[PDB]
């Protein structure tokens, strides 16, 4: 239900949302249509849910990291920038944002992490991670702490995980292998083992988050931290003489941060697509438009080539994308979304000490082959059950076995019940996309009884197929898209332990 005639933007909290508001005010002054900028909590997860229902902002700002999933699901609308504009941005930024050969969002700026130390406490930063303990101990004598950064978000801890080895998705002959995940190989093991050793050496605390570390460094408590461009403004106002440098080398190898590209995508459900285009091309991605949001909160290395000269007077940008030059651009494949969640859990699980390092990495790597497997299985079945014609696109062997077994068992239980499913669909009063969005509540209540079984989830998938059929009858059709995803999340969010325990979908097919 996006209103027509007014522009609504979503930008993460730790961004120059005041600068975005300023450019929006400029837009309103010129074009004469109201502009509103919001920073919803974890907007990267809010946007898909709301846009799936047809509501949401007319523009969504985020790293290219996950925009590929947005475009693949259809939430984003393909942009059509003239060749002249396509020349106005760095080619690698375009290649990063481009998905399936088509441009799905406008890159705003390329950013990567850096090691920011306090010159006052630490005259020279440690050139390698192995020196952190020593310095820590030294600074522990004077009551300070050497390094303190955000351990909650896997983005900040990843550069260390990827230093020695470790990779997200193995590239091969021009395409990824989503069945090949590098978050369980030796390099990631060593990196996260060093991190947990730092944690249990008292040099770090697990509960540290972004705000805690930022405040600590601003007050001058901690000598070093790890952060990206957006943080610098907070450092600047605290009057703590600071330097920013390449991340320490680990085991003789550089730490490779996942280079991100903050980019703006236009909502598919938005009737005001051209309005968003005017806001981005003509208004946002200009020298002054980007300069304002940078002065508010430095984005990092801007995508615009013209502004890069002004981007050069500041050594911090040089250090940041030096770290980037050590690192690689985040892939836009949709799996990446789930992947991040995966690593997130492991990062916490080992950091708190709940799970052993190798245990956490193995869990995070099974999350990559559990999430996408389940999403694919639900796909091509829910749509097949609704339309009635099996989709002929290729699956692997486990995928085909799961498809067949799900078909037979789910159709059988649908036939057996019939009246119960019909009455419950009536009792839910599913008429619009918001109803299927709220279907998450029954999703959680289904498993809330405290016991688990394959029968429960298979009956759930059958009910989902029935709901998709009736959505086709009531012509929602598009509601087939998120409902399937709605299942996947609750399967990976609340049932990951059982799914991994039962060998994933292999145990599912064996039990049926």
């Amino acid at each position: 239900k996006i209103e027509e005639g007014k522009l609504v933007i979503w930008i993460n909290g730790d961004k120059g949302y005041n600068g975005l508001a300023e450019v929006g005010k400029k837009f309103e002054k010129d074009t004469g249509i109201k502009v509103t900028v919001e920073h919803p909590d974890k907007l990267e997860e809010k946007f898909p849910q709301v846009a799936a229902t047809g509501d949401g902002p007319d523009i969504i700002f985020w790293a290219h990291d996950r925009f590929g999933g947005y475009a693949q699901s259809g939430l984003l609308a393909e942009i059509t920038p003239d060749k002249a504009f396509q020349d106005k941005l760095y080619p690698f930024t375009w290649d990063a944002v481009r998905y399936n050969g088509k441009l799905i969002a406008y890159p705003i700026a390329v950013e990567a992490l850096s090691l920011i130390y306090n010159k006052d406490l630490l005259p020279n930063p440690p050139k390698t991670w192995e020196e952190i303990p020593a310095l820590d101990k030294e600074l522990k004598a004077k009551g300070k702490s050497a390094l303190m950064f955000n351990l909650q978000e896997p983005y900040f801890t990843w550069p260390l995980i990827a230093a020695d080895g470790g990779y997200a998705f193995k590239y091969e002959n021009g395409k990824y292998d989503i069945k090949d995940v590098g978050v369980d190989n030796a390099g990631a093991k060593a990196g996260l083992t060093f991190l947990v050793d730092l944690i249990k050496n008292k040099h770090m605390n697990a509960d540290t988050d972004y705000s805690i570390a930022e405040a600590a460094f601003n007050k001058g408590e901690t000598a070093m931290t790890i952060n990206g461009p957006w943080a610098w403004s907070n450092i600047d106002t605290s009057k703590v003489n600071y330097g920013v440098t390449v991340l320490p080398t680990f085991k003789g190898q550089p730490s490779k941060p996942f280079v991100g590209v903050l980019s703006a995508g236009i909502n598919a459900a938005s009737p005001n697509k051209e309005l968003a285009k005017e806001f981005l091309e003509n208004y946002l991605l200009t020298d002054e438009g980007l300069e304002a949001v940078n002065k508010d909160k430095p984005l990092g290395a801007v995508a615009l080539k013209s502004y890069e000269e002004e981007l050069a007077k500041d050594p911090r940008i040089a250090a940041t994308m030096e770290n980037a030059q050590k690192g690689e651009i985040m892939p836009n494949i949709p799996q990446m979304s789930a992947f991040w969640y995966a690593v997130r859990t492991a990062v916490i699980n080992a950091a708190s000490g709940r799970q052993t390092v190798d245990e956490a990495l193995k869990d995070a790597q099974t999350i990559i082959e559990l999430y996408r497997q389940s999403l694919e299985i639900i796909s091509r079945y829910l749509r097949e059950q609704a339309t009635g014609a099996a989709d002929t696109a290729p699956m692997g062997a486990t995928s085909r076995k799961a498809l067949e077994t799900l078909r037979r068992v789910g159709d059988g239980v649908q036939r057996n019940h019939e009246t119960a499913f019909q009455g419950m669909l009536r009792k839910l009063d599913i008429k619009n996309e918001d109803d299927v969005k709220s279907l998450s509540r029954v999703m959680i209540h289904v498993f809330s009884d405290g016991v688990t079984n394959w029968g429960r989830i298979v009956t759930l998938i059958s009910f989902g197929a029935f709901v998709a059929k009736h959505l086709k009858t009531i012509n929602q059709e598009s509601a087939i898209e998120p409902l399937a995803e709605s299942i996947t999340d609750v399967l990976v969010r609340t049932k990951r332990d059982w799914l991994v325990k039962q060998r994933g979908w292999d145990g599912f097919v064996e039990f049926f």
Partner: antibody
Amino acid sequence: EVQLVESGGGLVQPGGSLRLSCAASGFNLSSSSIHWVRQAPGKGLEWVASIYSYYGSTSYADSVKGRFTISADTSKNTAYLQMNSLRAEDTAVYYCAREYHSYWSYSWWPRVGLDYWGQGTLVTVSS
Amino acid sequence: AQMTQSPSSLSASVGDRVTITCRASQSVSSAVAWYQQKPGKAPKLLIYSASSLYSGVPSRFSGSRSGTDFTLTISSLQPEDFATYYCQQASLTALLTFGQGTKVEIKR
């Protein structure tokens, strides 16, 4: 291993036209970035043209902008530098060099050094 | 994108430092590499990324960095090292810029 040899370097006239064909062996041509560099006699290395994107985007130096056209042939694995309106100062030893990083997604970054070079094929442009 | 090499040509004997500097002008990409060219041969890639050395090269070469400068250093010069040394930058845009190159020659 990786051996890339380019031929076609001969004698042409001012304002002439010629094409240099770089065959490669040991690696797929289309799976890596290809740069045609040229070194004039008694001069430093000079970069001429580049295929750098996974989607075939091409870039050229100002002196060879448009005038030179870089292309690939995945079937024959033979890159081509098709020249036109060749001038005398274009004479040099032309090296077809490769660049490839094991960690390269659909977007090819970071840019690494020219790992491999061909034997060079002197092209003389005179009347 | 301009890269300035220095010195034009230095004189060295076996076992010295004789570092070589390269300055990037109005460009802040850190993707810089150093190649070695012997007379009448294809240049060899010594180091890339402005810090990492190409595998198969002896450790005597080091790609130190000084912010806007990138320096190549030889811990102990050897007879084989006497050749020309080029530094090039692959800007974050689509471009490649090679330095003027500097020559290393025997000190007698």
